[PDB]
Amino acid sequence: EITIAGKLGAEPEILINMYKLVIEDETDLKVNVKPNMGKTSFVFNALKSGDIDIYPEFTGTVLETFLKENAKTHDPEEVYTQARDGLAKDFDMTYLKPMKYNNTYALAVSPEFAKENNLEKISDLGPVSDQVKAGFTLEFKDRSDGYKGIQDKYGLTFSNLKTMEPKLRYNAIKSGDINLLDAYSTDSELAQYKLKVLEDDQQLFPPYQGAPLMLTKTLDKYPELKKPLNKLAGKITDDEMRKMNYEVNVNGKSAYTVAKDYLKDQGIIK
């Protein structure tokens, strides 16, 4: 009778099943999962209203959506600390420790392009910028915090740049029509198409790490929630999350099964 909801998609469905798995492994609490409940504003309201007890929320989403505060930095831990202190104060909400992966914008390149030019980080593109054949989503191309940021902070302009309906880009990168695209760092497609995901070595992109969000009065009543959920703190790399999202979205496995496998492989569950 602890209700854990997820926002829409495979990733939050994996996460809430992880929350269920650790809580049930370590306590006598019974967990009901509510996958695909709805979007951020709706799920946050359900938490505030006591309709659900826990959901996974992103650190950068807290600052921009709920606190309406600018992050002084792009350092992941400083952003989390800001989210957590703000939620505690302004919403009487407890935001527990975040997982490792940072689901933010990413640039990814074909493996062939990475191999020829030894590409590991965005800054490595400088000397090969005229070789880039980019296929960007319209949002990334046109938002001041997307391609414009690449131009300003990394000094990179790609003369060969197309805007593409998001789907077609992976076929185009597969076919060689493009060799670079934007995505979010945990998208299953990046694993599916075997792309090299570049390090944002200048921390241009703002951090979005997931962590459990609940009302403080909930933790007060069920203190035993804290230790289980915090077993996920600092766990799950971008690549591990990519692979799990792939298992659900492409291989058709259930979020519960891929969650349980990961936790077992990590020794978090026996």
Side-chain angles (χ1 to χ4, degrees):
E1 65 210 284
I2 303 295
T3 297
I4 312 191
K7 289 182 213 185
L8 305 174
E11 180 163 309
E13 191 175 7
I14 293 159
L15 297 175
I16 67 184
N17 275 284
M18 284 189 185
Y19 290 0
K20 168 177 147 177
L21 282 157
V22 299
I23 290 164
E24 293 184 349
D25 184 68
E26 304 186 8
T27 81
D28 293 316
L29 299 173
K30 265 53 193 170
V31 173
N32 183 47
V33 298
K34 286 184 150 280
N36 289 307
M37 177 168 183
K39 72 187 182 184
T40 304
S41 62
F42 182 75
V43 175
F44 183 79
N45 169 254
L47 186 71
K48 190 194 294 189
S49 297
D51 300 325
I52 62 176
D53 298 307
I54 308 176
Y55 79 103
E57 188 52 277
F58 280 123
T59 53
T61 299
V62 173
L63 273 62
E64 63 205 33
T65 310
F66 312 134
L67 307 186
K68 298 204 172 302
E69 294 180 17
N70 262 265
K72 192 159 283 138
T73 67
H74 285 186
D75 178 75
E77 179 57 16
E78 293 186 334
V79 171
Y80 164 72
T81 298
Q82 203 175 326
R84 166 257 266 161
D85 294 347
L87 284 164
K89 191 210 166 57
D90 295 356
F91 289 104
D92 296 337
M93 277 180 183
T94 296
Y95 197 32
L96 292 179
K97 299 171 149 187
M99 295 169 294
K100 181 167 180 177
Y101 72 87
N102 176 5
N103 193 17
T104 192
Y105 275 138
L107 297 185
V109 294
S110 69
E112 300 112 311
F113 190 42
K115 177 161 185 64
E116 191 193 341
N117 292 303
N118 229 120
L119 305 173
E120 295 281 355
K121 56 192 170 38
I122 292 175
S123 60
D124 294 335
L125 291 169
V128 300
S129 60
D130 59 342
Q131 295 178 49
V132 171
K133 301 169 187 180
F136 289 149
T137 60
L138 251 164
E139 25 271 293
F140 184 84
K141 180 173 55 149
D142 289 338
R143 282 177 55 160
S144 56
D145 68 344
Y147 176 54
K148 173 157 164 279
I150 295 293
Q151 292 178 98
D152 296 346
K153 198 154 198 225
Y154 287 96
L156 298 167
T157 38
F158 305 135
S159 43
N160 189 332
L161 198 169
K162 294 182 287 292
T163 195
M164 298 187 61
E165 291 305 304
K167 268 182 74 81
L168 299 164
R169 300 177 307 151
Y170 284 98
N171 302 96
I173 211 159
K174 180 180 158 180
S175 76
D177 177 64
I178 64 170
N179 59 17
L180 186 144
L181 51 76
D182 70 284
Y184 282 70
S185 56
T186 63
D187 291 345
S188 56
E189 293 85 348
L190 291 171
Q192 185 176 16
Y193 288 82
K194 296 156 139 56
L195 305 183
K196 170 58 180 185
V197 183
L198 300 178
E199 183 196 7
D200 172 27
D201 56 293
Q202 292 299 293
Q203 294 191 345
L204 163 62
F205 301 131
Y208 296 89
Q209 293 180 309
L213 187 52
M214 65 193 77
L215 296 173
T216 299
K217 67 131 207 61
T218 298
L219 186 60
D220 286 343
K221 137 149 69 284
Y222 304 113
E224 59 265 45
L225 290 169
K226 182 174 185 192
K227 288 173 154 44
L229 289 170
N230 275 344
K231 298 291 207 293
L232 311 174
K235 302 298 298 207
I236 311 178
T237 65
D238 290 355
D239 198 62
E240 287 172 338
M241 192 66 264
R242 244 182 255 126
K243 281 181 170 55
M244 286 185 276
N245 280 334
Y246 173 90
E247 280 295 272
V248 174
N249 288 337
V250 178
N251 277 348
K253 306 204 176 178
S254 65
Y256 172 93
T257 291
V258 358
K260 190 182 50 41
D261 290 10
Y262 174 83
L263 295 176
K264 285 180 174 290
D265 201 26
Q266 292 294 299
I268 296 165
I269 298 296
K270 230 63 126 215

